[PDB]
Amino acid sequence: QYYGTGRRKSSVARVRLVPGEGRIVVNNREISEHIPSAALIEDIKQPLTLTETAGTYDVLVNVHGGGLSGQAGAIRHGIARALLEADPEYRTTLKRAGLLTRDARMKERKKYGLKGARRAPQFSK
Amino acid sequence: GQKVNPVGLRIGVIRDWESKWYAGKDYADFLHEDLKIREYISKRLSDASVSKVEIERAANRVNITIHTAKPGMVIGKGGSEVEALRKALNSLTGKRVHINILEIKRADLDAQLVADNIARQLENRVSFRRAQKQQIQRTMRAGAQGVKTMVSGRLGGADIARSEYYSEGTVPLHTLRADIDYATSEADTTYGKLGVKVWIYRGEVL
């Protein structure tokens, strides 16, 4: 019944979480077929392992935008701010590892005279 | 090459488009219509000096205001020529028009009028030094915060063109908070073409 907001990279996750057993799900569909890789199934359980609220809570998230790590980071930062609004007594401990810092890792604007974002065209005398 | 135009940079953030109306699916012919109507007033009222014109398209009936102070004689006994020019405008635009005239106080520090002036005595063959120097002192006597004037071309020395300027006060083009007003005018003489540019800084915008 506890709420958080998660934005990572053109991808905003609205997460509401309730006490539970650790059932993890998005858009009433299981993660394991929605994200297949364990390197992003670690994202959900990583903050609730650096703190101790691992098995007492389960999460319900609505998500839009970006690519797979794109909402993976969004999930992460959403459950982060959710646990800050839950028990902010370990706010300091969570801040020490970070994960509340909104990462400025968005795509850069393509600029004229260039290919991509920084690559100059091939140049010779 | 050169700089960007200060007022082109300041369009939409400090400056008005002077074409405030909106068209959609008639944008094109509406737009070229504002060009030829501006051409008509520009080469008709060149005697009494015009700087800028704002066009309104309220209910597609065109609406015009015209600036500057010397058309105080256009406003006066020349209500007849106001009516006649407006009849020619409705002859040109299909749907009719209504015009207004706005007096300008301190017409000395308006860029269009300055540039037209310098082009005029350059056609009248005063020295460019004299022209620029009296005009700049006249503006900063009028109260302008800073004025720089330009001239380029065959400045008497037909065998090699060059450029000349004088400026004092402060002219902060790099600051976008500044109010700048830019003109260019093209003085034609027997030597060919002589270019006039002028811009006026008139304090910042809070």
């Binding site: 890789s37 390197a39 670690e42 990583q46 392992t49 650096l50 | -």
Partner: protein, 149 residues
């Protein structure tokens, strides 16, 4: 100018054994995520079957056997192009060892990538790899030109 260094892709902080560290993160210098990690896991497994003991244990033993301590840099002094050896910083050490591991992993040329990296893990745990070979090559050449400093 100004020396900077930065963390990248480190795993979860607490109870980070190196096996879970490279199970969840780490190394992964093959390209993009996906067809870089799966394959690494398969290589890691095909050596538990080969030697029935700890995969990460033999993996860091292989890394240890790859670890150099001397690396040479060239100099412009003199018209004979002398080269001077320096001590390798540990971050440079691990990234450079892992670099040679991956490059003759893809160079060693077996039928597929997982058995390629698997045989490289075996041939670096034992001292019969091309990377071990070049390790001793730079070691002995640094010992040869060590007189300069």
């Amino acid at each position: 100018k100004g020396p900077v260094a930065k963390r990248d892709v480190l795993p979860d902080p607490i109870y980070n054994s190196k096996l879970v560290s490279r199970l969840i993160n780490k190394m992964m210098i093959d390209g993009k995520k996906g067809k870089s990690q799966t394959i690494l896991y398969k290589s890691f497994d095909i050596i538990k079957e080969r030697t029935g003991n700890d995969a990460m244990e033999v993996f860091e033993q292989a890394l240890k056997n790859i670890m150099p301590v001397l690396e040479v840099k060239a100099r412009r002094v003199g018209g004979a192009n002398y080269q001077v050896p320096v001590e390798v910083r540990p971050e440079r050490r691990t990234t450079l060892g892992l670099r040679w591991l991956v490059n003759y992993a893809r160079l060693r040329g077996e039928k597929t990538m997982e058995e390629r990296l698997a045989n490289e893990i075996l041939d670096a745990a034992n001292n019969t790899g091309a990377a071990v070979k070049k390790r001793e090559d730079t070691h002995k050449m640094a010992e040869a030109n060590k007189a300069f400093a």
